[PDB]
């Protein structure tokens, strides 16, 4: 049957992408928190 | 300028496609800069192989392959190559 993920690149970069994170105060807090953990992947 | 055209051509391509094209249509296949346009390639070949006139340039970006080695996953540089046609 139809599963849950169903990928779309434009939809992925537009709801979780770098510029989507940087366009809100809380999205920049997400990025700061990924950087403090040292994650090699900030944004999808 | 004339100090950027020396960095357009990175090296000729030696393969079965490049060797078969030369013998039949006399088109040179080169590995070119990752930023070289068709105009720069045209101006680099005729400056640097004196006596030849380029008809056309066909360029393409080809992506490097992921060649794992040891315990690591690593990929080869992507690169740009050009087919250049010379006047018969």
């Amino acid at each position: 049957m139809k599963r849950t993920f169903q990928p779309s690149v434009i939809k992925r970069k537009r709801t979780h992408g770098f510029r989507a994170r940087m366009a809100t105060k809380k999205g920049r807090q997400v990025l700061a928190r990924r950087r403090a953990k040292g994650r090699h992947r900030l944004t999808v | 300028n004339n100090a950027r055209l020396y960095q357009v051509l990175r090296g000729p391509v030696f393969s079965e496609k490049s060797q078969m094209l030369g013998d039949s249509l006399g088109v040179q296949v080169f590995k070119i800069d990752s930023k070289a346009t068709k105009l720069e390639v045209k101006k680099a070949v005729e400056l640097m192989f004196e006596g030849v006139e380029v008809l056309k340039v066909n360029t393409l970006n080809v992506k490097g392959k992921t060649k794992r080695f040891g315990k690591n996953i690593g990929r080869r540089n992507d690169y740009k190559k050009a087919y250049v046609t010379l006047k018969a």
Binding site: - | N2, Y6, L9, R10, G11, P12
Partner: protein
């Protein structure tokens, strides 16, 4: 090597750098086509180009 480059005029340093850039292409082609036995000219040529562009910046600034 740098001794006989420090007393060259700006006009002839730019003119000398041009051969070194053109020489860089010839090494690149010769190396790829298997005509470069001594594979240490490429390194010294790159350093020489770096040396020339360092001097050019100096004689253009001071």
């Amino acid at each position: 090597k740098i001794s006989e480059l420090r007393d060259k005029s700006l006009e002839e340093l730019t003119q000398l750098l041009d051969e070194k850039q053109l020489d860089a292409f010839r090494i690149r082609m010769a190396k790829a086509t298997g005509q470069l036995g001594n594979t240490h000219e490429v390194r010294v040529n790159r350093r020489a180009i770096a040396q020339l562009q360092t001097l050019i910046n100096e004689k253009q600034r001071g």
